[PDB]
Design a protein around this nucleic acid. Structure first.
Lengths: 214, 138, 138, 214, 138
RNA sequence: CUUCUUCAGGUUGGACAGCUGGUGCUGCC
RNA sequence: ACGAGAACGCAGCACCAGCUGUCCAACCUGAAGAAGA
């Protein structure tokens, strides 16, 4: 059995995820955001979402401290995100996906594009001279509908898996996703968190929703 | 993809060389003031022109659309208006525009209306700024 | 997006060119006064007009509305009052306003009652003034 | 932990922070303010607040002598704000967020806009020529409700961190936040300062409030 | 092959030796600034050169045309424009661009207009960065 | 019935830059 | 009336597992509506 965790990621502040492939002009942008190559639609890579969620959850579950290596995290994190250790390989019960922004029509109703330009600078404390940059940033109010695949392997510890999934989601809500988060950017929110059966039906699927929506 | 700088068509590969030619020609034979003086266009003014081009380029580039919409063409016509205003205010800026075909380039983009035409125009202006920084210095 | 000043005014590829040709037509035939022509209406009359249009424009830009509020319509009415008085002051302002169809544009944006037409009209007036400074001076 | 530092900043004189990417008109406005793209509301970038707080706190914690590189400051500044110092890279405990305008309702009832345009001068005692500019300033009387997240790395380093945060906020009071601040603009005041825990409860959190709410 | 440099000729077999020679010439007798020198270029300034070259290498590494397309040629010309621009910003970069004749190689690539020529040029630049590594650091 | 409508500088700067693990085994003459 | 004739180097097998494009940085500096209306 396999389950699909749907939901939406709503940007609270501007969100920047780096990665640059071509044509950064000399007066326009210095750090573009990652975009879907075909449709040019900005996206949240599943790698970055998975990594931030794993970091926050592993730090929270262990002791509040996290200095180890990913293949030596706690057993919940190891069983939910995977482990490549030689003799102890845990197959990941989560398959994150790349997350394109869904409410572009809603944004176009407000006569705005999905990305803004943010003008920053650093001020040399010696001479008080400013060095300007130009960060492309996905505007607040953008919504990213996602889908995370959960491989239902153990029928009994699925509840603890989903409690930790919700805990990691809530840790992201009080943190940033991608880019210069401590300097204002990156704030996000989660909504419409619902798990559904990929094929067939699961006995505790009404329980797994109420431990996701609450 | 075939701009019409002056009397010579500009393609998508000679923008850098032709902008270099424009900057060197201005640097070698510069504008002469009314009051018997010599001066160039400041880096602030050309940087403002590039910013003007950067205002529209930053929204054009994040697209796959073959032809620019009516809003982009309206902004381009406004940038041409501001070019005319800058030319009318400081005669050195008018000289800089006339020695290049920056007005003729913007008119060619306005007449072509395609995204690739404005992309080449942005490339040409970026190269003009690049060769000002390289040759004129700071 | 569409304006009526008698010559199918459009937001794209139309406002700058038509403002430029209006300015040229003004300059091609200088205004006739007593007893010498070429009054050379300075920027002081053209500004002030620009200042009122641009203060209304300043209050309009930070408003995401398809239609202009009654306050903006009263501001445009006061714009028309100021323009009528300034034209009545001396005939050269009358010639400038009539030839450039400033009052016709005001009436058309008053009929349309949308932010798009007002921004088009402000863009048009700025085009008038920019091309006046380009082809004139002072 | 995930302590959440809430509060409100109010401008006493009109504050200017730039970063617009729109066509400035011939006589309309030569320098507008930074605003949200979707809601068109004036914005205080959490990067601006973080940078000005780091400058002000760092200089006052360096005997009024701030000359070093940002990564070459005292330990407490780095442990609150972060640093990429080569071996002991410090994560920023403080997570500032882009602060959006909040009190549009009372301003709307006041028949005023969130921003005004000021004409001042550029006059000269010499050959009499003035160069007029147009600064857009967020209306004095604007409230920006903020939420700054906090990381409790160690319980020993919570009361020191929060008293330093409070004194950094109160150092901004006798200063400005950004823009043309040397010329009568940017005066800010902080009100409703407090802190709450994101998840669960924290011991001696009232000690934080008694040194942050007073 | 046939990549002109200005004083010598690097064929497809002779890019690494020339790159190491140029890096040794850079490592020997460091740059002289206003204050008598003497710091050397940073790893994250030859970075920019390396990603600039890779932004076309990734698009040319996987193809079979002998001659480069008009889109690749435009991006190579843009690399030339960019390397001209950034050299004017910093002098410690300009000596790197001159002592290691990037511009001549780019111009020859733009003159050959062949896939193998640009592959050789990219190999030369990559070897140059690789040799800056293991001699300097930081 | 006057008099400028913005001008002059910084346009990104450093830090990391791929690491670990498997790595042809089984069946036939 | 060929040291011959006949005879698939073939069958099974995921280039895969783990990994935040991150960290630090204020869109900042300097700039009277006077003046004989």
């Amino acid at each position: 059995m396999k389950l699909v965790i749907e939901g939406t990621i709503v940007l609270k502040t501007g969100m920047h995820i780096g990665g640059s492939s071509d044509f950064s002009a000399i007066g326009a942008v210095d750090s573009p955001v990652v975009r879907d190559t075909l449709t040019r639609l900005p996206l949240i890579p599943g790698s970055s979402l998975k990594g931030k969620m794993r970091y926050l959850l592993a730090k929270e579950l262990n002791n509040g401290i996290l200095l180890n290596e990913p293949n030596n995290d706690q057993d919940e994190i190891l069983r939910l995100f995977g482990s490549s250790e030689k003799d102890k390989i845990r197959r990941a019960r989560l398959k994150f996906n790349d997350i394109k922004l869904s409410n572009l029509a809603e944004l176009e109703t407000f006569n705005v594009s999905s990305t803004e330009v943010k003008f920053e600078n650093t001020i040399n404390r010696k001479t008080a001279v400013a060095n300007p940059r130009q960060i492309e940033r996905v505007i607040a109010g953008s919504k990213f509908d996602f889908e995370i695949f959960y491989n239902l392997d153990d029928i009994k510890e699925v509840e603890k898996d989903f409690e930790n999934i919700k805990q990691g989601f809530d840790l992201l809500e009080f943190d940033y996703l991608g880019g210069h988060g401590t300097r204002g950017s990156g704030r996000i929110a989660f909504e419409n968190l619902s798990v559904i059966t990929a094929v067939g039906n699961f006995e505790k699927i009404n329980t797994l929703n109420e431990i996701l929506g609450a | 993809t075939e701009l019409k700088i002056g009397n010579e068509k500009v393609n998508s590969t000679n923008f850098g060389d032709f902008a270099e030619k424009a900057i060197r020609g201005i640097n070698h034979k510069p504008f002469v003031n009314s009051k018997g003086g010599e001066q160039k266009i400041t880096t602030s003014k050309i940087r403002g022109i590039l910013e003007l081009v950067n205002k529209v380029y930053n929204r054009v580039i994040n697209t796959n659309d073959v032809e620019l919409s009516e809003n982009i063409l309206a902004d381009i016509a406004y940038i041409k208006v501001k070019i005319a205003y800058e030319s009318g205010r400081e005669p050195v800026v008018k000289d800089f525009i006339q020695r290049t075909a920056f007005t003729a380039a913007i008119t060619d983009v306005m007449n072509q209306r395609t995204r690739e035409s404005f992309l080449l125009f942005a490339r040409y202006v970026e190269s003009l700024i690049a060769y000002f920084k390289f040759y004129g210095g700071k």
